[PDB]
Amino acid sequence: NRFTVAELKQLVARPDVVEMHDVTAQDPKLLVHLKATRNSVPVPRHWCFKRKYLQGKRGIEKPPFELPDFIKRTGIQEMRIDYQKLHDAFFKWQTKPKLTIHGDLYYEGKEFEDRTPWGELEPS
């Protein structure tokens, strides 16, 4: 008694959101509506993959973890004492990394894939 994909595609405001498995839901019309909502996050793509998550990430040599530049410039990477510089690294030099926006999930291939502001702090 299910819709065809063809049928469901015409019954909804956003056909592009419809996938092949959607018509097999308990409520496909609710499911597609929910997928269309502002700021909702997709289900992780690998739910239907036979291999377990991240398990195909094999057979590739990767370099060791790249330290952030403020820690790197502390020189401890070469040491393996200067506690003032060690403080300044975290409390002066610490710069925020390239943080990802809401909803942009990770997966195996992702890695290799007057203008003045109000209420700003005064300079020290």
Partner: protein, 212 residues
Amino acid sequence: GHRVIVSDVQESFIWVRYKRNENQLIIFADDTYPRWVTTASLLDYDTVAGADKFGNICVVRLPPNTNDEVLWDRGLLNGASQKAEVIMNYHVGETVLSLQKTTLIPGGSESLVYTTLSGGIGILVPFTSHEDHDFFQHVEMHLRSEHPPLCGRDHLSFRSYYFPVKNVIDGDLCEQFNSMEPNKQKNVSEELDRTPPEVSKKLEDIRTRYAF
């Protein structure tokens, strides 16, 4: 200028640019949270203060290098390609139907005045420097534990009612300092490396710069 900020009843803030020559209204940014907006104040060319039906204030800001000069297009998360970032969240406790950036006293500093449905009037005021901010943050942290809310609700949880509290210190909690028994004032001021008169002075000094 050419910017238009639209409050949606539920989908919070949408930034629209009017283009004269093309004669077009283009959406160029939106929020990443539902907000049941009741009122809005523009703080600066990139920043909006919002109130919602659920007693919250927020401040949303366009991140730097946001571009306003804009079936193959889908946008991001079923909304606009660029996202405003919530730089402030605070559960006021009462529904706010007005916000206004204004100076309440002559020669005083500018503040964000807000009115509530319950007839309450208050302000949000920017700290000018680290030292001040850090001091009232430490005051708030000590008062949260040493002078807990009367009817047994966690203060941080209350200010984080619908969204986690972000970049607001509750001065209504800080001014509880003056109501405490003197032993507790002594304990808290010792923790602050101050004496109680200096704490009360700092409390009065902020509340006297922006608005009586």
